[PDB]
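Q: How do we represent a protein-ligand complex in a form that can be generated token by token?
A: Start from the inputs.
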Amino acid sequence: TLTRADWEQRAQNLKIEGRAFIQGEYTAAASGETFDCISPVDGRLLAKVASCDAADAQRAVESARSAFDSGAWSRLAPAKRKATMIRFAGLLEQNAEELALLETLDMGKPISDSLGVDIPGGARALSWSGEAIDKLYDEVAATPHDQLGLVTREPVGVVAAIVPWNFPLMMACWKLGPALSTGNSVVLKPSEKSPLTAIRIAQLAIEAGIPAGVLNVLPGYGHTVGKALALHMDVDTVVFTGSTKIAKQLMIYAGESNMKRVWLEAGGKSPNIVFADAPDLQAAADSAASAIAFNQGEVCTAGSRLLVERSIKDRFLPMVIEALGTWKPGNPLDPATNVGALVDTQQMNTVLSYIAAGHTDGARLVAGGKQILQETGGTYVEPTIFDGVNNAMRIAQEEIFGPVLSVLTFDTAEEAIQIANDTPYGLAAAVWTANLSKAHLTARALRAGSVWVNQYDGGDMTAPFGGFKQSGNGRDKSLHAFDKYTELKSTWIKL
Amino acid sequence: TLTRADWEQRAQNLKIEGRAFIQGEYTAAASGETFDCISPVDGRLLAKVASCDAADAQRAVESARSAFDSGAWSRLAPAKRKATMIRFAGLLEQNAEELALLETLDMGKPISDSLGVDIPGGARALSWSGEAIDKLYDEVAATPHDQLGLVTREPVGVVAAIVPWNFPLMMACWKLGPALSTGNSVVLKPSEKSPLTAIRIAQLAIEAGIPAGVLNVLPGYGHTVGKALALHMDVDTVVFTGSTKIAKQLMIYAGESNMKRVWLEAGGKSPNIVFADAPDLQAAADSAASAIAFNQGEVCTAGSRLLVERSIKDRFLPMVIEALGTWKPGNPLDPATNVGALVDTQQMNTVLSYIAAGHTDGARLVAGGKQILQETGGTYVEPTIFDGVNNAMRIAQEEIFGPVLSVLTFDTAEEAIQIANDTPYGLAAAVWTANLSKAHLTARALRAGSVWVNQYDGGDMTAPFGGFKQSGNGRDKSLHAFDKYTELKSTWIKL
Amino acid sequence: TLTRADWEQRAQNLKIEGRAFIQGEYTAAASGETFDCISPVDGRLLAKVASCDAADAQRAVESARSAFDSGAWSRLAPAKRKATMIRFAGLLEQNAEELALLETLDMGKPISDSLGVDIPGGARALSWSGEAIDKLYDEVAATPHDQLGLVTREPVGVVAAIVPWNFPLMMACWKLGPALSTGNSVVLKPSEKSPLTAIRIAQLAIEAGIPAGVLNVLPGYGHTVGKALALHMDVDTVVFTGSTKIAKQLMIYAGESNMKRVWLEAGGKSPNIVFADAPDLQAAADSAASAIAFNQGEVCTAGSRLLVERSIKDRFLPMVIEALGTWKPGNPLDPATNVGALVDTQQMNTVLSYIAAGHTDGARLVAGGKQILQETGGTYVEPTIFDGVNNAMRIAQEEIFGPVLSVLTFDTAEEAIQIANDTPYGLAAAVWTANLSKAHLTARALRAGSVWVNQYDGGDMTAPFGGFKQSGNGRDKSLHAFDKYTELKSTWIKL
Amino acid sequence: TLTRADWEQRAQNLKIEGRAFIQGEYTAAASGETFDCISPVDGRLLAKVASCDAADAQRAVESARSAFDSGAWSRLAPAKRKATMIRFAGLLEQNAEELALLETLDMGKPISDSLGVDIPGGARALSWSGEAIDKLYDEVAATPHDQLGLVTREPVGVVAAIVPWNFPLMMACWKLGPALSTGNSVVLKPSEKSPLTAIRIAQLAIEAGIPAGVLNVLPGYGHTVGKALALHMDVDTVVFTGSTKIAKQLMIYAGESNMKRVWLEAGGKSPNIVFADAPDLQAAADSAASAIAFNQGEVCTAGSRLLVERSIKDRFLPMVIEALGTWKPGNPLDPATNVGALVDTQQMNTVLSYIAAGHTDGARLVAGGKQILQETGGTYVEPTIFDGVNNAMRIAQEEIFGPVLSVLTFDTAEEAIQIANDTPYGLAAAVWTANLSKAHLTARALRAGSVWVNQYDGGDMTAPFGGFKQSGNGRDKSLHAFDKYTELKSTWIKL
Ligand SMILES: NC(=O)c1ccc[n+]([C@@H]2O[C@H](COP(=O)([O-])OP(=O)(O)OC[C@H]3O[C@@H](n4cnc5c(N)ncnc54)[C@H](O)[C@@H]3O)[C@@H](O)[C@H]2O)c1
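Then emit the structure tokens for the protein with nicotinamide-adenine-dinucleotide bound:
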């Protein structure tokens, strides 16, 4: 087990690749332009990263298209694609320490989280998806004797994947797993706030046996190369994870261009409903704190609204405060740290402004509330709780994407459901109760893509993940994720 | 069997409903405005139809939402929804003669087609979908012993369905069958060129037991009430059948509003590939003619590009010409008629302009090419064939939506495939060959949602139907149609 | 609603068919022999029924085989088979009053049960199965590009169905629905204790459009014609519902003959577990009584072992006694009657012998325990309860097939599960508890084909039904029932 | 690449384990008795192998049952069972040279086949099955609002697997893959003619992480320990691969004991149908020879009946003779050898007696026909062809299980199908034709579990494998194999 000093030495000794990757080779952007990749750990310069634009999108898509048409990957035997995807996952694990360190330096999450959650999670999405390839069957319809009706799935062709900065490698892998497994070529566009691991795994893909052109990586800004990919007339599908605002703009881009398929994973304001008859209130308290403090609250499914049955509120809230007190910001390179830096100054100022809005709209600060560790040259905020929140308050309605918890009360299950569903979002929700009927009926009534019962942040690769309403469309993970990267064909044969 | 005189008597004796339908009652538009519904068979006034706008969209959506929330239909037992949908289908059949007559008068297709194809096809979509409801199973994941992982589907809520004029009732039913079967409320917006059957079946739905508010019908223009539904902030999903141009606009509307799900069935320029080793050339010739002449060529999957192997071209083209000669425009109310009127003057001018374009771009007219029966006051054009067509010509690239055939030649299977896929569209295609390998390998290479082998216009309710590329996204018919009207939920329960 | 006098008039006015049915015609047995069909309601002669033997089995199998080979039904379009099966179900309903009367007279169940449960249940099995036919899809494997791998299902051919007397029509339909829907020819052998409804519906099948030879019916004894079918070298599959003893004998017959597939639905000793935290004790008490008294306890899944948590036992047992008191034997032709006659004298003696065994082995009689209504000439026994039962006692280990309840106690969930699973059987079980974890974990631990939670006798046509262990193999109802009547084929095509 | 001399040295240097394996340890049989394991390569003594009997079956099943009930494997997380199964497969590959050598020495197949087909094939069944575990989903029925209907699968408990000698390790793995993956305990009973690899992999299972008691191995005779397992009252399921005669006896044993589930893979007499319009006659000739000579014709799906369209017979048969001449018996330890020894003297004498019967019944010997290489001390027979065979001849009806081909002619497709289906068997069949319709219609009409088109011996792990009629019931490989090792449960929960 590596120490803080070990990680600090390794961080200093990294040579960091900043180039784009197109047709099997690292490359500068056509313009030669770069942007500074700055670490939120302490503000050090990590790398000058290629700043791609429309011209680079064009070259990457031409490369993607040529590779798809060659059939080198798209017509490779399923069992062979499986083997390659599993080797790809294996190379992530083999290079786990470097990749984890890049993630931590790039966007500030604790090294123990990068190493323990992100890298294994990314690898698992690649290998599980790979494992599934030849376990999938298409269909033969019930037809008259002189007909053979086949209903099959084929890869769409060229896929653009635009991903965010909060789980850079893992979110990339949630897309790459099913998209590559089904045989598509993918152009990956990582967040400008976290380009490094995406850039690095482009090389690993080649080493695993992914052909040149099949996985191209274009670092750069959303409003330049991201937009260019979404408007491209020869991209078949764009998959996206990010804000609801940008997600909507992608639907507009598709409409303005070639009617490409658009699949979105967007914001959340997930309600964590704790009933008086929860089987384990301490577990509910620990989980409620973890739900908002894990990864600095920079989680789409953060349990940012805590709904507590009023009769246990006075006992439960102090339990949640004490649990939250164990989540402490610190040096992300220290293995003992469980809360890291926020991704940058821009994000931190947004979070601080929402904390200010909590005060303004009349909520009661009961824990945290301040920026800390300023002397480090990094960006850190205390996990924060507001009590006495009404669901119409800004901190109840709007996604904060920091470790800021809103606490609301209710007195009936029906009110809990009404409050929980009172949102434009619908990514996740949780219910804590020992009652059989109340558990299933409440879960059934919540309009959310994931509903966790007597736990938070549940599910694994077998569980589809995605939004109701403005939290998105379509699902990541599970076999259902494959459907975003394929087209149905009905082949009706007269005999 | 009814005679022409019988159908003319019946046409005269219809009382035709023109009002919108909201919350279980026929109603004027809020503005009181109407538009004239004129028959293309000769020009008579059928009815003054309510011209709905945004205010009516709002009232209909409020009705739909309230109905959905009440659970009267959305939480009705699956077996009971099945019985209702089957009764709904049964009422279409019970009233087939009236509905077919309305269809024929409304948009000009032959009465024998309305009676023999449209009404049975529509009824079948409703009954088959109903039958399927309790044959569908959701999923239980493989999880650790202390977890129960449920993956289920739930109705999205409020669905707007916007449909075209070429198969008014049948297309409405393709949407209504699965949308209603899954438990949604639906707001149906029929084409302003063909509002009458949708208006009529609103009452039949009530009679079958569909609760008030669950199926609302808003006749009116695309740019008024259609647009209002697509921009509405409380519509969860819009499903669409129509032009690629408008389909794209709907993606923009969704992005501008509430990120509603958008499912599109759009245009086509389907290739009909006849190899020299086709098993039955006469069958191929008969189907090639039917593929362009049926429903006046106003068919999304019309075989508008006939690709013929050069070595049989001289023999096959005269066969296609002779077969096309049996398709003759005539009085739509005559049961002997197999080709009806074009939907309106605007449509006839478009077809005539494309025939002119055929000449201009250098193709050779070998059949038809002219308006006929002007004395009737109706709009009729001869089924038309151009030979010597290059795929770059306008008549080869652009959807005409009239009975105009382009004939192209090829020398190799590779060439046929390249030409076939050389289109922004991808709705359907056909292959004619007696060879096992060539049939399957060519079918596999064609980028289209339906591929018919040794037949044209194949499939039934078991066959998903929809586009690759700019022909749309998602599928109508089959069980896959249901997925457009539901959301996946992952319920992970800690035990 | 018909009165007792009405049903008695109708009983007198029946003309009852007693012949076998082969190749579209009613027929005597080859030997000319008959057996007396006597009613347990009072002892009248209903009909002299053909007593078939091996010669008749041979002729029926030859008819079945020829019909199968002709394709009249086996290669009939799926949608047409669906329509026929639905018409078949519709004829059962059209003739419900006659069929229910035949059932009640034949084996003694109350007329209100025959009319309200048996005939609708049978019709439902036929129509639901029919509806499902064209909703089923076979499979296409993930293969290399030069391979097409089809995995399809085909009817086995000739199916023998051997059924019992407790639900004569409904059990026959549980087999016929999926066996006929998949395209097989079926030879049905009803119990010699209840031949009449099977004989009758043979004609209804013809009327619905089932071709001659596809459904043959051979009334007669198990050891003659039943055995002949099970040993027949040209029967592909036998499906069976009856005793575990005979079920085992069928496996031996298959091994002695042609290795035909054997699917068994056999005996049961189902445990009904009521925890102290059951949500509704009165509902639990009412269901516990119904579970043993319904259809005279002549139910494979009768809740014959009531397991009660010791801490509610003193409160719950009087509730069960009072609820059982509402179940009173009476004239089966009286519509007010909720408990009918036992099927014959042999059955009554068996029940009385087990009541004697209850006393001998040391249990405590707390309700019923005696034959009643001897003056009627019929066979009736009081619903009976023994308290203080140990699971090692004969009444706890052996299936009684009468209305005799054994009451056992437990202190822990672990104990309840151990007792519940302490049986050679495994057909059904029930759990009553308001606790989420306990309900799912206990249901998971129970080795039984059906587990009902907070209800008894649950499920519908969507729920597969069948045994663990010596309660049988394979499942009736649901789509899984179809798999007993088809064979998988892997067609791997090199392209 | 190892030479013949290398393999001869390795064979001499093996230390061979002969003991049974129970509860994590090698053990003598209770009696202390052994049988001589003799090599058909040259007659050398390989090992004295434990000769288990009823007492050993009892101890193994008690061990299996205790392990299943402990949940160490049966309740282990799916993802963890997957990982263990993949490591298990990995250890087969890691020890491939030893395992391949054991197989070759034990039952005589060429070392290049053992190394290239058997070991990789066995490993692949284990890992593919393992990979599938968490890709499988169970079901949630469509039910009323106050019901939750779960349809799930659970392991049956204790599985007996009885396997033959022709593919000892691979057939064992076809059973072990799905049986262990679903969580069962397995008692494996290898053929007394080939016990060695089964004995050896028992240790590898433990090293991979399979808990003690979960995989027990009992070498010994069929009529002692095999029979004891099939009659055991606490074995839930027996799966079998072997002769039809013994397969039938297992059905009888189940009936005599506890009604255990019985799944059989039995004999074959597979027809290889070559039409005049086969796309590649040379390929058909090569494959027809391989179909009968591979693994000494000791293959269940050996293409033992060659049906050739009469018009190509005179040209085709010499092609088949020339191809068959490339398959030459030789030293199984020589890597160049492509035909090995027959398993023993008993088998060889059976084969020679069938060759004698070919002469007697009037067939024409056109190739091979004699025992060879007698001086080696081993058992070898020339690949043999009889022409002018009629389907009623013994060599056409009966399974020979040696390299003996029967050649038949036909003149119509209909006759080809009649002849092909004229058998009590139905394991596999093949069709060679370039015609689309004839390929699919003929394949559809053949009553066989596998149908190969324009190839022989096709399919991989995605293709279910097993018999129609007396070739067995149920399927090995694919996801369908899992169903033999699990039970369906319907859990209906009232809410
Ligand atoms: N599974 C999920 O649903 C999921 C997971 C993690 C994070 N998120 C969401 O991500 C957001 C935080 O991430 P973010 O700040 O990177 O979001 P963002 O919307 O600002 O950007 C996401 C990605 O889109 C790109 N982008 C920005 N503008 C673009 C444009 N005009 N056209 C094309 N691409 C453009 C960015 O460069 C980045 O790669 C939150 O709203 C959070 O809820 C969702």
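Residues 111-132 of chain A form the longest helix (22 residues). Chain A has 15 helices and 22 strands.
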